[PDB]
Amino acid sequence: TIAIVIGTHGWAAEQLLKTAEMLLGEQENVGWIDFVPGENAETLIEKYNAQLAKLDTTKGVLFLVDTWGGSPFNAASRIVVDKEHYEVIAGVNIPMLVETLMARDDDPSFDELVALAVETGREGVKALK
Amino acid sequence: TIAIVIGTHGWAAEQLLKTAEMLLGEQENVGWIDFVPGENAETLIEKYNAQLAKLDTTKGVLFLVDTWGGSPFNAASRIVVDKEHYEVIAGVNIPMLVETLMARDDDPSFDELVALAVETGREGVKALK
C-alpha cells in the first residue's frame, strides 16, 4: 500500500496512530517521528529517512503533519520536493487518519488518496450545535 | 477564560495538549480525558465531570474531540445538551488547538470562539503540492 508517515512537534504522532489502531486494528506500512526542542529540520530529515527505509514506498508516500510551516512540515517538504507520488498534508486529525487508512486498502491511486485525505480531514471538523 | 476539555479514544488528548504547549507555553484552564477499551459513555461522563470540577466554566466550555459519533463525542454531547455556552467540536487538530488557545486570551465571546475553532481547524488541512 501507499506509505504513510506521521510527524508532529512533541510526541503526539505515535498516539494519533495508536488511536487510529484502536478504531481500525493494527496498521502496516505506517511510520512516525517525534520532534524534541533542540532538534532542527536536518535532524528530522534523518528521522524521516530512517522511517522510510522500513516502509514500502513503491506506490508513494504521504506525510501527515500537524501544522503548516512547522519543523515537521518543513523537513517533510524538503523530502517530497522533486519526488513523484510524495506529498505533505498539514492539519492531521483522526477523521483524516481513519478515512485515509481505510481507503488505502482498496488500492486507490496516489491523487485519489491525497484528495480523500484533505476532504475527510476538513469535513471531519464539525460542531454539534 | 473559556474552558477547553480535550477527549479522544486512547491516550492522544494529553499529547495534543503537550504539543500545543510546546508551541504556546503551558496552558491554564484546559482539561483532558482518555478512553480505554471496556469503558462506556457513562464512564466518560464521569471523567469529563471530574475534569470540569477543576475548571473555570463561568464563561463556557468547549469540548474538542477526535471524531463525530465516537464515545468521547457521545458522552460530551450528553453534557452540553441543555447548557448555555457549552459546545462539542469534532476533528480536533493542532491548527484548531493553537488558534483557539491563542484567541481565548483576548476574551472573545463564546460564539466567536466556536466559529474560530471550526474555521481554523478546517483551514489548517492543506496539501503542499
Residues of chain A positioned with their CB less than 8 A from the CB of B124? 67-68, 90-91
Angstrom distance (rounded) from CA B62 to CA B39: 22
Residues of chain A positioned with their CB less than 8 A from the CB of B11? 15, 18-19
Distance from CA of B13 to the nearest CA of A (A): 9
Residue of B nearest to A121 (CA): B125
Beta-sheet pairing, A86-90 with B126-127: antiparallel
CATH code (residue A91): 3.40.50.510
Helix then strand then coil, % of chain A, to nearest 5: 45, 20, 35
One-letter-per-residue 3-state SS of chain B: CCEEEEECCECHHHHHHHHHHHHHCCCCCEEEECECECECHHHHHHHHHHHHCCCCCCCCEEEEECCCCCHHHHHHHHHHCCCCCEEEEECCCHHHHHHHHHHHCCCCCHHHHHHHHHHHHHHCCEECC
Domain count, chain B: 1
Write the single-letter amino acid at A101.
L
Indicate yes or no: CB of B124 within 8 angstroms of CB of A67.
yes
C-alpha cell belonging to residue A40: 532542527
Resolution limit in angstroms? 1.7
| Closest Cβ–Cβ partner in B87, B88, B125 for A122 | B125
Phi-psi region of B31 (alpha: psi -120 to 50; beta: other; left: phi over 0): beta
Angstrom distance (rounded) from CA B69 to CA B72: 8
Angstrom distance (rounded) from CA A112 to CA A72: 24
Residue for cell digits 484567541? Answer: B103
Signed CA dihedral, B107, B11, B74, A27: sign only: positive
State the DSSP code for A124.
T
C-alpha A94: how far from its chain's center? 11
Residues of chain B positioned with their CB less than 8 A from the CB of A125? 89-91, 93, 96, 118, 121-122, 125
Angstrom distance (rounded) from CA A127 to CA A46: 39
Is B92 in contact with A91 (CB distance < 8 Å)?
no
Coil, helix or strand for A85? coil
Angstrom distance (rounded) from CA A100 to CA A20: 10
Strands, E assignment, chain A: 3-7, 30-33, 61-65, 86-90, 126-127
- What are the phi and psi torsion angles at A33 (to 5°)? -135, 160
State the DSSP code for A33.
E
Domain encompassing residue B77: 1-129
Chain B residues with a Cβ under 8 Å from any Cβ in chain A: 8-12, 14-16, 18-19, 22-23, 37, 66-68, 70, 77, 80, 87-96, 98, 114, 117-118, 121-122, 124-129
Coil, helix or strand for A99? helix
Find the length of chain B.
129
Angstrom distance (rounded) from CA A88 to CA A77: 7
Angstrom distance (rounded) from CA B113 to CA B83: 16
Angstrom distance (rounded) from CA A64 to CA B4: 25
